[PDB]
Structure formats: C-alpha cells, structure tokens
Symmetry: D3
Subunit: 150 residues, 6 copies
C-alpha cells in the first residue's frame, strides 16, 4: 500500500505501549523512502519526568521513532504488508550516527519522520534522514539495522 | 493573548496528567470563543483499554477536552492570564447536553476544539461547539461548567 | 450477580477504561443496576485534581454507558462471551446530564440505567448514578454495538 | 472520628500508587481504628495480579492495615496535626501472625480493623483483621516505630 | 532441573506480571531445599512515585511478596520441574506469613537478593523461610506457608 | 565527593519518572570522568511494550542514561553539589555519534555507565564512553549536551 494507519502498524511492528512511536505512515516507496509521523501530546507518560513543568519530547525517542520508521520500511520492502511473516522477524539496530538536534519537540507538535535507504547489503540496512515539525528539520540521524528470525 | 502553548495552559488549568487534554490554543476571543487542539497518539495509556487492538479516543474524553477549552477561555476572560490566581481554582462540570459523536477519533488525528460562549454569569459558563479532525466535525457538544476556589 | 470476571467476558473495555466492577441487578430490555468502587489508588486522580481527588464527571457517564452496554449485549444475545469478543461499543449521543454531587475516593458509585428505546445494535438508555442512596448525577445516552 | 481522603493525605506521607486507605470511619485514641479501601478493577495492580483473574495482593492488604495502624498511632499522640505529621515517620519493624482466608476482588470494600495491643514510647503494636462485608478475609499483627523525619 | 533461570524462564513459571512480578533472575536452585534469586531495584519503578515522594523506599511488604514468589517458583519447580504447560494451570497462594522483620531500608540501586529455604513440604503445602539481602547484609526476614492450587 | 545516591541525583538532575535513568554514582572526577549505573528490572513500564514476552531495555534509553551521567558530571564539575543552582537548569541533547549496540540488556542487569570528558567549554559538554554489564561492553556512544537556564 502507500498509507498505513495505526491498526496496520500494529500488525507489522512488535513494539507496543509505551514504546510504539509511529502513529501513521503517509508515504512508502519500497526500497527507497518512508514518510511517517507520531503526534506529540502532553497526555503521554514520559512528560511526567521530561521535564516537570517543561514538557520536551526526548531526543532519544525521536531517534527511536525514526528507527521504527526505518524498520517498517525495510520489512515492507522485503515482504510487503504481511502480518504472518512479521511475527517471525526482528530488526536489530546495530548503530546510530550523525545525530543532531536543532529544535526541541513539544506537546502539540506533529513529529514527521523522513527516512530513505542509504545502503542495503543482505540482511543489513542503512537508513538516514530527518524528523520534521511543520516543514522545519528538528533532527537528523543515520541508523544501521540487521534483519533476522524471531 | 490569542495563542498559548502547553506551558501557558499548565499555568491556567488545574488539570494534570492523565486528565490535561488540551495541548495548544490557536485563537482566543475573550468572553466569546476559543479554538484549541490536542494531538492524539497511540502512546497514550487510555488506549490500553479503549480498545485492545482497536485504538479509539473515548468520546467522553473529547467532551472533557472541549470543557477544558471552555475552562481556559472562562478563566482568562475573568482574570486574564494570571497564574497566581489560577493556581488555587478547580473546575466542576455542571451539565452536558446535545452531544453527538459523528466520526471516531484515532491515533494520528489532531483533535481540534471549537468552543463558543453561549452564556456566562460569574463563575458559571455555558459553552457549545464542535471537535474537528481535518476540518470535519467529529463531535458536537454543549456544556456548562463552574470555576471555583479550592477550599 | 455478575462479577468482574463475567463483566470481562462481555464488555470489550479494559484498563484503564473498564469502569464497572459488578452487576447487582439485570432485567432484559428493562433495566440494570451496577456499580464501581472509587479508590484513591486510581491513576485518574493524579490529574483530577492534584491535592483534591474528584472522580471525573465524564467518567461517571462512561460508567453509565458501559452499564447500559452490558444490558444491551445480554438483552441482545444473552450471556455469550463468544459473540461478545467480536464486538466493540461506540458512543452516539449524550444528553440531559446533570451532576449534583462530586464523587470522591471511598464512594461506591452505583449505576441505575433503564431502556428508553432500542433497535438492532442501537440502544438508548437513561438513568442516574448514585452514592449511598443519593443521586449524584443523571444522564441519557445512545450507544452502538458494532463488529470490530 | 471520620476522616476522608484529604485528611488522610495530610497525615500519611504515602501517595499513588501506594496510599491504600480511602476513608476512616472510626477512631478511638490509644485504642482502635476502623478504616477502609475500596477495591476496583481500575487499579494498575490488577494488570499483573493476575491477568484474567483480578485478585488484590495479600501483602497489599497488610500494607493497608499497617497504614491504618500507623494513622492510629500517630493521631493518638498528636491528633489531626498536618504540621507535626511532616516531622515524623512511622515505619514498621515487624509483622506477625498473618493469615489470609478469603480472596479480595474488584467490587469489595476492604475494611481494616486494628486495635492497639500495646505501646511504650514510640513503639506501638497493633493487630486485627481485614474484612469484606462482615467476614474476616485476613488477620495480622504489626509493630511500628514512630521517629523523626 | 537447572540452577540458573533468567526472566524468560521466570515468565513461563510464575503467573505474575507487571507491576507485580518481583523476581528478575534465579542464581541457584535446589529441589525441595532452597532457592536464591534477586530483583533489581531502580528508581524507574512506578511504586517509588508514592513511596515516598523525595524519599524512594522499596515497600517492605513488596520485599516479602518477592520472597514468596521465589518460594513459589521453588515449590512448583521442585514438584514438576521446568514445566511451562502445567505451571500455566497452577497458582501459588499465601496461606500465612510470620516472623517478618525489616532491618534495613531498600533503595534504588540495590540488588534485592532472596534467600529461601524449604522448612517443610507435603504435597501442595509448602512452608519456607529465609531472608532478603543486599550486598551481604540481611535487610529483611520472613517465613511463610504457601499453597499450590488450581487456577480453575 | 565521589559517590552519590538516588537522593543526591534527585537534587541535581531535572529528570524524574519515567525518565531518570541513573540510580547511583560510584566514581566521579571533576571535568574528567564518571562511572554510574542504573539497575534493570522487569518491574519497569517500558518493558510492557519492548517487547511483549521478550523484555529488552531500549538501546536509545541506554544512551539517554549515559547522557544523564554526563550531565551529572558536567553540573557538579562547574557548581559542585548545588541543589539551589541545579533547579534553575535542564540539559539539552545536541548530538549523538558513533553509537554501537553490541549486547542486549535485560531485567537482572546492572547497566554501568562509563563516561569521560572529550571536550567542554561553558555549558557545552562533549562526553564519550561505554555502558557495561558484568564488565562487558554492551554499547558505546559519544554525545554533546548543553546545560541551559530553565527560563
Ligand atoms: O531484539 C529485538 N529487536 N528488534 C525487534 C524489532 C523488530 C522489528 Br519487525 C522492527 O521493525 C524493529 Br525497529 C525492531 O526493533 C526484538 C526481539 C524480540 C521481539 Cl518479539 C521483537 C524485537
Ligand atoms: O526510612 C524508613 N521509612 N521511612 C523513612 C522515611 C520516609 C519519609 Br516520607 C521521609 O521523608 C524520611 Br527522611 C524517611 O526517613 C525505613 C526505616 C527502616 C526500615 Cl527497615 C525501612 C524503612
Ligand atoms: Cl533531549
Ligand atoms: Cl467512544
Ligand atoms: Cl467533573
Ligand atoms: Cl496474594
Ligand atoms: Cl515499607
Ligand atoms: Cl533497541
């Protein structure tokens, strides 16, 4: 497909509350790129501690959302939307590089992940891109993952 | 004076996690109307139970969100943006009428509240409006809440 | 009576949105009496409100809808956990609700719903929420049972 | 003789999700207390105790009796005094003769019945039962120690 | 029957789940005799939000609960060995708790070690006693009798 | 000093539940290095979703933990144990580089943070190091953080 909602995302990723950080897929081009996003609301538990009276979505969780997006891209590229096969795979994330945070993310923001395949050799996938809020780059990162059996 | 962010909301409304359901205020007209919104994400505890495998933002919480929007409008119309006064006030729901849910709200939606003051007298405010997602009415509601000093 | 275990087999709601603990009375297509205990040990109170525990008015209504939901499921298909696991419930309308007394921890929130009208999966009920014999709230609502 | 959650919050230092006393229905200084905690499915504890079979932890029933006994010990000496309450801490040294007879589930009103067995200085020993609708669901003896915060 | 079991194995034997599964690993196990396990204590636990604000103390009753779960694992395990399918139909219940003594407060950063020994077993009835230790020191003492019952 | 417990960490770091991922500091050298750790237990909410029936501590949270240790070093380096000045600040992640995840971290693990100061000037600190479990490197990373006025 091209558009995947939360119910579809749930069938592909093993992630669940409170670590499923991708609400909807707006664009998906097999083996090339994925545009998705996660809404940022105050009503999230992480905001209880990050930080009191100063709600700021954790930079490491922006990268996690990006990794998740990359993982969905990789998986669908190999087997498409296949819930059955999804249950038998795992995407190990081996490395993270060139991460830069330019603007803080906060409640009310629509955190949009933009990832593209940088390299794919065998079970290894290298993805990179940015996270954006209303058109502006809020962060960037590269990630390398390996695909294996669960 | 017309747009407020989560920090400004925290200084006005007494609500807190997991019952602070307004993330940002986009426009505000004293004693008249207010437009605000709350982002809906899967990463909300309410979804563990509503319902398993089928994330649906609870209709009653959409109404709560509209009430809180009215509350913000009510408080600032009264004392303006005054945190020290807001600090010791709570808000009680008095009545709810003519609410209709038209479209289910799910993760990924930007729930936009549109409230207009139908009548107010002292601490008693009567608002009515809609909750919208991508310009479409997903809910209609009318409510009356009371602002009161913690005692 | 129907205890939490039975309620779980019929209603699709789960933590932290399952707000009915026990069903004390049930009369098909007529009325249902049930309740939910209110204790400080509930997450909602962390935010409603700090230093002043007030059970949310909208949750009192949710508790009434669920009570009504249980009446709809059983009136429709009897106590059938199998048919129940395929359905969910949507709120359609809420009207004429009034809150008279705040519900707080230590209260036994009793739901009293009667059937006003029904047709197919669409049920309209109304009644009150009571604490120690006094009406703390009134309400009318219409909900729809659907295939998830 | 009757304290509601706000009063309880001013005396006990416990907070969510460890404040296990909702209301105090009876209190005789140096003698006894009767209080209760409502049990509802809407409690986080039930997610794991246990999945598909909600049962209020027996050790949490004891904790509730401890908190009640500590509330008794404290108010007996200083009464309803929020200010002093902040300068003291009632922790427990021992717990004994505990027995569980009936499982406590969502829908039950868990009533704590503690009495002062003996006390000397800041060391108080209470004991009694946990009851649901008139029946004994548990019994226990505890020895608290009141010290400076 | 092995002597070391990790969380993956504990999850298959005990029915407890978040936030009441209080045993993270088993370091030694001896059928009908004893068990040594532990639970890591971190600030990132919901219980510390209210016990207590600004002064995180791991609840004494939870230390006891942890010892009971250890004894429970030992009991079931001594009887059926590592049998997940059967474990799934049994459940251990507290019958009594006696001689509980709290000696030292447990706090975030501590490794709460459970040392339980079988004082008497007879069918589904098990009486165990032991201590909760932190860095070699006894922080708690307890004794309890449990029952292995049917889940239905 | 050289060792701080949870009560000291609370008075310095702005992080609270569920994002305070450092439990104890075992070694600290002003402007040079720090060794701290966070206990890993199944009794953590994060494990409900990462992942069901297969608890693994999130790699990004391991880095976050290293960042917090660095932040604790940075602050006490410039102000010592000063709770009054500590509450007038937060820390912002600026960059992360060279992170390798070698071994999965699970309940029962004592996640040890080893960080050294690579560069530092003003409120800008650059640290790098590893996260260890029973003396084995389970991860590596470099990061730059900034201590900023709460405003
Ligand atoms: O160690 C694991 N790493 N990654 C799992 C995983 C799987 C997919 Br599919 C994915 O898109 C991503 Br991102 C993952 O992290 C893992 C191990 C077991 C399970 Cl059941 C799930 C995940
Ligand atoms: O320190 C204990 N209990 N409570 C302590 C405590 C609580 C709050 Br509230 C407080 O502000 C402070 Br000063 C305390 O020491 C304790 C003392 C002994 C054991 Cl064996 C276990 C716990
Ligand atoms: Cl950050
Ligand atoms: Cl709904
Ligand atoms: Cl209300
Ligand atoms: Cl139990
Ligand atoms: Cl304790
Ligand atoms: Cl990971």
């Amino acid at each position: 497909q091209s558009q995947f909602f939360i119910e579809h995302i749930l069938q592909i990723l093993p992630h669940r509350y409170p670590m499923l950080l991708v609400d909807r897929i707006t664009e998906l081009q097999a083996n090339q790129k994925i545009v998705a996003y996660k809404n940022i609301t105050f009503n999230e538990d992480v905001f209880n501690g990050h930080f009191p009276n100063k709600p700021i979505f954790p930079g490491v969780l922006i990268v996690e959302g990006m990794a998740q997006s990359g993982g969905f891209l990789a998986f669908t590229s190999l087997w498409g939307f296949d819930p059955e096969i999804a249950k038998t795979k795992i995407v190990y994330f081996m490395t993270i590089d060139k991460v830069k945070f330019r603007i803080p993310v906060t409640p009310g923001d629509r955190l949009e992940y933009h990832l593209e395949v940088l390299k794919h050799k065998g079970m290894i996938w290298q993805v990179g891109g940015t996270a954006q809020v209303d058109g502006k780059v809020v962060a960037e990162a590269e990630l390398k993952a390996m695909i294996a059996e669960r």
